[PDB]
Scaffold this motif. Structure first.
Motif, PDB file in Angstrom:
ATOM      1  N   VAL A   1      90.514  57.915  32.497  1.00  0.00           N
ATOM      2  CA  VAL A   1      91.054  58.213  33.823  1.00  0.00           C
ATOM      3  C   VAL A   1      92.560  57.976  33.903  1.00  0.00           C
ATOM      4  O   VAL A   1      93.276  58.843  34.425  1.00  0.00           O
ATOM      5  CB  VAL A   1      90.318  57.413  34.910  1.00  0.00           C
ATOM      6  N   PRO A   2      93.104  56.853  33.414  1.00  0.00           N
ATOM      7  CA  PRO A   2      94.550  56.635  33.583  1.00  0.00           C
ATOM      8  C   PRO A   2      95.398  57.546  32.719  1.00  0.00           C
ATOM      9  O   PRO A   2      96.602  57.667  32.976  1.00  0.00           O
ATOM     10  CB  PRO A   2      94.736  55.163  33.192  1.00  0.00           C
TER      11      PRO A   2
ATOM     12  N   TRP B   1      94.245  51.229  37.614  1.00  0.00           N
ATOM     13  CA  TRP B   1      95.067  52.429  37.720  1.00  0.00           C
ATOM     14  C   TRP B   1      94.760  53.111  39.045  1.00  0.00           C
ATOM     15  O   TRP B   1      93.656  53.626  39.246  1.00  0.00           O
ATOM     16  CB  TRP B   1      94.792  53.366  36.550  1.00  0.00           C
TER      17      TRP B   1
ATOM     18  N   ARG C   1      86.996  53.610  32.774  1.00  0.00           N
ATOM     19  CA  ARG C   1      87.624  52.685  33.712  1.00  0.00           C
ATOM     20  C   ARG C   1      89.072  52.370  33.361  1.00  0.00           C
ATOM     21  O   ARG C   1      89.853  52.019  34.253  1.00  0.00           O
ATOM     22  CB  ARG C   1      86.814  51.387  33.778  1.00  0.00           C
TER      23      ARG C   1
ATOM     24  N   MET D   1      84.136  44.266  40.164  1.00  0.00           N
ATOM     25  CA  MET D   1      84.412  45.391  39.279  1.00  0.00           C
ATOM     26  C   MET D   1      83.415  46.522  39.506  1.00  0.00           C
ATOM     27  O   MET D   1      83.790  47.701  39.500  1.00  0.00           O
ATOM     28  CB  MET D   1      84.377  44.931  37.822  1.00  0.00           C
TER      29      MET D   1
ATOM     30  N   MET E   1      78.485  55.091  34.428  1.00  0.00           N
ATOM     31  CA  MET E   1      79.786  55.534  34.912  1.00  0.00           C
ATOM     32  C   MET E   1      79.914  57.046  34.758  1.00  0.00           C
ATOM     33  O   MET E   1      80.533  57.535  33.814  1.00  0.00           O
ATOM     34  CB  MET E   1      80.913  54.821  34.160  1.00  0.00           C
TER      35      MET E   1
ATOM     36  N   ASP F   1      84.199  50.946  41.072  1.00  0.00           N
ATOM     37  CA  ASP F   1      83.744  52.261  40.632  1.00  0.00           C
ATOM     38  C   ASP F   1      82.971  52.976  41.731  1.00  0.00           C
ATOM     39  O   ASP F   1      83.157  54.180  41.949  1.00  0.00           O
ATOM     40  CB  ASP F   1      82.886  52.123  39.375  1.00  0.00           C
TER      41      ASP F   1
ATOM     42  N   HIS G   1      92.759  41.993  36.319  1.00  0.00           N
ATOM     43  CA  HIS G   1      92.678  43.336  35.770  1.00  0.00           C
ATOM     44  C   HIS G   1      93.753  44.217  36.384  1.00  0.00           C
ATOM     45  O   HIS G   1      94.088  44.083  37.564  1.00  0.00           O
ATOM     46  CB  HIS G   1      91.304  43.965  36.023  1.00  0.00           C
TER      47      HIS G   1
ATOM     48  N   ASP H   1      91.103  53.746  45.848  1.00  0.00           N
ATOM     49  CA  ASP H   1      91.860  53.907  47.086  1.00  0.00           C
ATOM     50  C   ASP H   1      91.137  53.299  48.284  1.00  0.00           C
ATOM     51  O   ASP H   1      91.765  52.652  49.130  1.00  0.00           O
ATOM     52  CB  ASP H   1      92.156  55.389  47.321  1.00  0.00           C
TER      53      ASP H   1
END
Ligand SMILES: [Mg+2]
Ligand SMILES: [Mg+2]
Ligand SMILES: [Mg+2]
Ligand SMILES: [Mg+2]
Ligand SMILES: [Mg+2]
Ligand SMILES: [Mg+2]
Ligand SMILES: [Mg+2]
Ligand SMILES: [Mg+2]
Ligand SMILES: [Mg+2]
Ligand SMILES: [Mg+2]
Ligand SMILES: [Mg+2]
Ligand SMILES: [Mg+2]
Ligand SMILES: [Mg+2]
Ligand SMILES: [Mg+2]
Ligand SMILES: [Mg+2]
Ligand SMILES: [Mg+2]
Ligand SMILES: [Mg+2]
Ligand SMILES: [Mg+2]
Ligand SMILES: [Mg+2]
Ligand SMILES: [Mg+2]
Ligand SMILES: [Mg+2]
Ligand SMILES: [Mg+2]
Ligand SMILES: [Mg+2]
Ligand SMILES: [Mg+2]
Ligand SMILES: [Mg+2]
Ligand SMILES: [Mg+2]
Ligand SMILES: [Mg+2]
Ligand SMILES: [Mg+2]
Ligand SMILES: [Mg+2]
Ligand SMILES: [Mg+2]
Ligand SMILES: [Mg+2]
Ligand SMILES: [Mg+2]
Ligand SMILES: [Mg+2]
Ligand SMILES: [Mg+2]
Ligand SMILES: [Mg+2]
Ligand SMILES: [Mg+2]
Ligand SMILES: [Mg+2]
Ligand SMILES: [Mg+2]
Ligand SMILES: [Mg+2]
Lengths: 77, 149
Positions: free
Chosen positions: B31-32, A38, B27, A55, B1, A59, A35, A64
């Motif tokens: 966001v991106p 971003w 995801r 995954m 989420m 979240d 994957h 980071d």
RNA sequence: GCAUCCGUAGCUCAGCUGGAUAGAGUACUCGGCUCGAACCGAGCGGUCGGAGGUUCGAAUCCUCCCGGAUGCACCA
RNA sequence: UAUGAAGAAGGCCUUCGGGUUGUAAAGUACUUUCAGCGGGGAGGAAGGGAGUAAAGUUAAUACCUUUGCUCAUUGACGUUA
RNA sequence: GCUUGACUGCGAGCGUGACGGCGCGAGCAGGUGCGAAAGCAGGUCAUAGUGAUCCGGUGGUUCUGAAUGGAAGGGCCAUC
RNA sequence: UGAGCCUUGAUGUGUAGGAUAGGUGGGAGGCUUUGAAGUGUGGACGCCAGUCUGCAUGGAGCCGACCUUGAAAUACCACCCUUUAAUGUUUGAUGUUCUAACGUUGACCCGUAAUCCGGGUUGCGGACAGUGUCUGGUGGGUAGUUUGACUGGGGCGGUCU
RNA sequence: GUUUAUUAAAAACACAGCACUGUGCAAACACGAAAGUGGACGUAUACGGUGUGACGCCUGCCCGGUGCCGGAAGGUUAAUU
RNA sequence: UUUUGUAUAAUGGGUCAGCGACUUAUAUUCUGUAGCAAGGUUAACCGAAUAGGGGAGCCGAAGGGAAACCGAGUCUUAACUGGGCGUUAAGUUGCAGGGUAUAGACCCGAAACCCGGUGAUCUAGCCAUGGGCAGGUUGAAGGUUGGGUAACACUAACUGGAGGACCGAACCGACUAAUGUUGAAAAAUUAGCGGAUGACUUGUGGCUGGGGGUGAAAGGCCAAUCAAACCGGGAGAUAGCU
RNA sequence: AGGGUGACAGCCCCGUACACAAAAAUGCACAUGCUGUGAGCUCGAUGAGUAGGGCGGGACACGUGGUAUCCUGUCUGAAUA
RNA sequence: UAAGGUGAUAUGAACCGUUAUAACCGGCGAUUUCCGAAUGGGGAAACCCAGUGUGUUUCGACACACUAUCAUUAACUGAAUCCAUAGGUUAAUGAGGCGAACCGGGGGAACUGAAACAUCUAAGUACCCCGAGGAAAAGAAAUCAACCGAGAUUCCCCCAG
């Protein structure tokens, strides 16, 4: 190899059972997927080989924070 | 989420609205592209602060609205010097520009835009009620007269 | 060891879809007409698998069985 | 706007059988021009001014004047198109 | 004709099997049936009609119940 | 577009009839300017009998209701069932269109002296494909094994309590 | 032509030819836990598999059984809920 | 030795010498013996230490019952005059021995299974790069020149040199027979035989590895070994058999 | 204690019992000096994709069994003094 | 420490020593060809072929030194692509291999026993792989107990077949 870069999950071995309880050796491999995550701080896409359980933690933990642990782990993302 | 909106993405709501949404949506897309942000302790509090800060802005502006209102509402009648009507009929129209100048000299500054001359353009001579839309909703009321020039 | 469903002219089936009372095709008789084919219409050929329940009323719903089927299980 | 006939009733005529209004209505779907209200929003605006820097202009290129620029500009209509 | 002894707990002493086991049994206790009673009845004239243990199922049971009170599960009895 | 559910409304003939009484009750009450009954077909459904009822219509009437009916009635209120028409909801079923995951053994650029790889650009595909877990089917493709004894040798036949 | 080196060289295998079938190319298939490679730097006038086995004349009947292919309404049916 | 039975013409052994097979550990039962005795005895450990300490424990003196429980009784049953099991009877700790149990378990011997390695210097196939095939025949297509046709077709002659073509050395194969069989040779020699420009043969390298390879396919070949190579390990596999 | 010495040595020899030895290197231990290292007290805080659960296995003597507890390939997912 | 001594087969020769530089023993150094982690490149191990730099000169050459890879760190430069990033070049450290058993972890049989054989046993044994130390591992209770208490881990004897 088939190793999760986040959780460190690796293949494990077990037995196939049966109605006669016959045991045959097998392997359990992680649900790994490549994957492109971003990362906001670098405004870039970084590709990671992660498990499906990995995954979920991304979240919860933040992109980071996990990478900070990875640099401590020296996994060379 | 859980994720905090930064705009009015589709039907998800508007800027600053934590909403449960399928992981994939944010995801890799919301966001991106920057259309929203994940609902995290740090981020949510900052947005809620922004929420309450704009509420305080709304409070402050509407508070100063009633300020201007009362300042001039309670009496504070003003009159202007218009060419002697001579047995009636005024020799000119009293426009938004002139009426704004009058109240402004009194101190309570008003822009002609705000002024709303009800049921006329101040054609007669003598006393004539007026009104001012001080705020976006608050309505006022002032008495204005006319005399010799 | 259970769970479900099916049982209706001689036959094949509607079930008169769950109580305000049995239908068709085929089998057979007669007739229509016709050398047989072949066609048609009447008639005849069922108390509805059996026994308990319910209600003013169930072949039809409940209980019990009989026979059949499909499922399950399943390592005495 | 479309559907909409029991060709409603009622109206009028009537060869007293009818016809006529007329699918018009009612009703049933449908749409909201403009006018209601609310919220935005061009264009008419070119200008000069203040500055700047250079150039022409000088004894001194001071004076100007020409460029460019920089900041802040102005709309009666007008609660504008 | 009337009936359920095709009874329950037991059992002296025997028979027959390498064993597992199988068979016979007076008498005793409690409750029966048939007889007026003496008495007889613990299936069928007798000898074939059958399958150990493990595992699981059913009913019963103050036996057990991993801190305690229960329970699960196990045990015992009946039984598949 | 199925469907569990949301509430509402509505539906309810044995016959007898009082008959659009589903059943079950309480039930002489009912009834009532809030518009007495009420006119205008309002329609639907239904026996097409009848019933409730859309807004006005006018101004005090309105109704339990015996032979019968199992019962006593769309007088009456409560509670259910059926029939359910619509209503939101919650899950799915397809179909269509996207891009942003993912794919690209398409093109182009760079790493780069490179038919690898990586990155970038773009095109195409696209919530498929593909992969993981679980799961049904198939599977001498590949394994681990079984395939009895007696018996005038064995096999065959027969036999095993 | 090939074959049992070391008791069998044949009527055995191969063979050209023929037919069926799979395969649209990130091909099928095969070797590989995978990447990848072969197939093939080929593209159905190609490739793989199977049987038959130059040539000549020909290759009849059976789809019940067992496979394969197509269909998908119904019956039955896993994980899941 | 094995057998109902062996001088047996059933097995074994040329001979001698050497070597070569009832052991060891732990636990348990029985016998003998010694000690103590309704008691006996310690283990680890401590310890100048074969002493002593350590009684943690173990066995025995009380059993019955599935058990709870009761107890010289107890269980069975409602209850037993009953019946079953118990109650007078010395055990325990060493040492030796007879056994058993777990270990290889007296020794030697399988065909095999599994694991990790070594082998394509042989051979099979393939890959790359080189080499070899005396000599003599047959005379395809095509070509030329004629003859024939409107042109072909066709035909004749002459050129040509095709072929898993012919005969036959090298080379390669290995069909028959003889010899040889404790050979010259663990597959050959002698006389004949087949192919011999090809699906030929050969040199030098390379690649494919054991449930795998490779195989114009015989279960063939894969280092004189192949219906699953060799080496080491599991391993002293196992062997109701000799 | 042993060994050797022309056959068996307390007194032949080498040793042995005892008593001693280190320029240099080094072990160990104590002390000490530097270089870091922080002791104490108060007030807080109290390990979340985790525990747990579903699925598939494994480990606990314990083979799914009525099976606690531990590890998790998969899918979920808390409380938090 | 020394009156004897130049290792052995193994003599001999030529010598060295004798009161302390013979020899012998120990401590500390020096030298330590070639191959081998082998490290300048290559390679059929003990061989072949270099580059750079310093210094030598008899102008033919010669002598040293450096030049592997990876990890980590720091500088400098440096794409697609504007910054960046990837990448690249240096410099420092560190690691490479070998070695008996013991240890932890990642994988993991079958023969055999069950008088066959699948569950089971053999056995988490043999073997393979990774890593570490003189020991390793474990270790300071989300532990046990049972209403009394104990107080990390490891090891031994019991509990107990
Ligand atoms: Mg308007
Ligand atoms: Mg009798
Ligand atoms: Mg308990
Ligand atoms: Mg097989
Ligand atoms: Mg086996
Ligand atoms: Mg036999
Ligand atoms: Mg046999
Ligand atoms: Mg031939
Ligand atoms: Mg041969
Ligand atoms: Mg050959
Ligand atoms: Mg031959
Ligand atoms: Mg053939
Ligand atoms: Mg044929
Ligand atoms: Mg067929
Ligand atoms: Mg057919
Ligand atoms: Mg004799
Ligand atoms: Mg003899
Ligand atoms: Mg002692
Ligand atoms: Mg005691
Ligand atoms: Mg007794
Ligand atoms: Mg003794
Ligand atoms: Mg003994
Ligand atoms: Mg030839
Ligand atoms: Mg020939
Ligand atoms: Mg020849
Ligand atoms: Mg061989
Ligand atoms: Mg084998
Ligand atoms: Mg071996
Ligand atoms: Mg073994
Ligand atoms: Mg053996
Ligand atoms: Mg805590
Ligand atoms: Mg969980
Ligand atoms: Mg589980
Ligand atoms: Mg069991
Ligand atoms: Mg059970
Ligand atoms: Mg459990
Ligand atoms: Mg080198
Ligand atoms: Mg066995
Ligand atoms: Mg050390």
């Amino acid at each position: 190899s088939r190793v999760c870069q986040v959780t460190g999950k690796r293949p494990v071995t077990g037995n196939n059972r049966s109605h006669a309880l016959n045991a045959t050796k097998r392997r359990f491999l992680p649900n790994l997927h490549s994957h492109r995550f971003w990362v906001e701080s670098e405004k870039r896409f970084v590709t990671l080989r992660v498990s499906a359980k990995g995954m979920r933690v991304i979240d919860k933990k933040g992109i980071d924070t996990v990478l900070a642990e990875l640099r401590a782990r020296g996994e060379k993302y | 989420m859980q994720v905090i909106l930064l705009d009015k993405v589709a039907n998800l709501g508007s800027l600053g609205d934590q909403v449960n949404v399928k992981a994939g949506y944010a995801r890799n897309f919301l966001v991106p592209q920057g259309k929203a942000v994940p609902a995290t302790k740090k981020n949510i509090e900052f947005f809620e602060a922004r929420r309450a800060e704009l509420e305080a802005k709304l409070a402050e502006v509407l508070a100063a609205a009633n300020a201007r209102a009362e300042k001039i509402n309670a009496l504070e009648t003003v009159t202007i010097a218009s060419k002697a009507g001579d047995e009636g009929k005024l020799f000119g129209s009293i426009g938004t520009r002139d009426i704004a100048d009058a109240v402004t000299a009194a101190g309570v500054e008003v822009a002609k835009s705000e002024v709303r001359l009800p049921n006329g353009v101040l054609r007669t001579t003598g006393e004539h009620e007026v009104s001012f839309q001080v705020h976006s909703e608050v309505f006022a009321k002032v008495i204005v007269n006319v005399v010799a020039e």
